[PDB]
Amino acid sequence: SGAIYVGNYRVVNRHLATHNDWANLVWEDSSRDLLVSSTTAQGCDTIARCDCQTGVYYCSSRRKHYPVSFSKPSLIFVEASEYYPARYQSHLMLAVGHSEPGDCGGILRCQHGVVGIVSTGGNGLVGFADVRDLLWLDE
Numbered sequence: 001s002g003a004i005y006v007g008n009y010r011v012v013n014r015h016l017a018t019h020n021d022w023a024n025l026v027w028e029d030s031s032r033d034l035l036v037s038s039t040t041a042q043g044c045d046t047i048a049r050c051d052c053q054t055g056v057y058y059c060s061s062r063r064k065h066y067p068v069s070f071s072k073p074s075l076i077f078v079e080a081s082e083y084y085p086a087r088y089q090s091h092l093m094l095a096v097g098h099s100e101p102g103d104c105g106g107i108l109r110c111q112h113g114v115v116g117i118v119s120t121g122g123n124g125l126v127g128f129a130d131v132r133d134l135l136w137l138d139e
């Protein structure tokens with residue numbers, strides 16, 4: 001679990017979105033596993049606008065933050081689940097690191113701010129849904 005609060009927006013993993021998220025929907029994309037809903041309160045976070053390939057993410061299954069090198073946002077195959085059929089997930093970045101179901105929503109940050117959120121994992125890898133291209137979150 002976990003979310004990004006920026007201005008009047010909440011960014012969450014689409015497969016974890018609540019009834020309230022869907023009732024206040026701004027945008028969603030199943031191919032990215034992202035959903036953005038509106039909020040009444042002003043957010044707590046800032047978004048990075050960069051091409052960093054290093055950062056630190058929060059791993060709830062270990063109650064720890066870990067530094068990672070991660071790949072560029074790309075199209076990567078993801079196996080079927082109670083949430084999605086087998087498909088290519090876009091804007092996904094992989095890193096060598098620990099992750100388990102329940103870790104989705106953990107924030108990845110670089111020196112410039114929020115980069116993305118944990119969205120995939122397994123076999124010593126962790127995948128992050130990128131949010132740096134969503135320039136409209138700022139305005």
Ligand SMILES: Cc1ccccc1CC(=O)N1C[C@H]2C[C@@](C(N)=O)(C1)C2
Pocket residue numbers: 015033078081083084089099100101102103104119120121122123
């Ligand atoms: C995070 C993790 C780590 C180790 C094992 C399993 C997992 C869970 C995982 O990969 N997904 C669960 C939901 C979100 C997901 C997607 N993006 O399509 C992928 C369906």
Ligand SMILES: [Zn+2]
Pocket residue numbers: 048049050051052110111112113
């Ligand atoms: Zn950066």
